[PDB]
């Protein structure tokens, strides 16, 4: 969810 | 004569593949990111809701 897009679009902006 | 200009049309019409030119001038313009979409592996971004 949120947490996952945070953790996956960290480096990817 | 007849069938010669009721069948040079119909071949022509009849052997037509221009959706594949469609796709190859798409190809033309993007292919490195459209067709050799192997960069990533999944995506990371939000979605709607």
Redesign the interface.
Request: hydrophobic letters at 40%; zero cysteines; glycine letters at 0%.
């Given at each position: 969810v949120?947490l996952m897009?945070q953790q996956?679009?960290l480096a990817?902006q | 004569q007849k069938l010669k200009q009721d069948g040079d049309s119909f071949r022509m019409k009849l052997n037509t593949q221009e959706i594949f030119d469609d796709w190859a001038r798409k190809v033309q313009q993007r292919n490195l990111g459209v067709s050799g979409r192997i960069f990533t592996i999944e995506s990371t971004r939000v979605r709607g809701r």
């Open positions: 949120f897009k996956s679009l990817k | -």
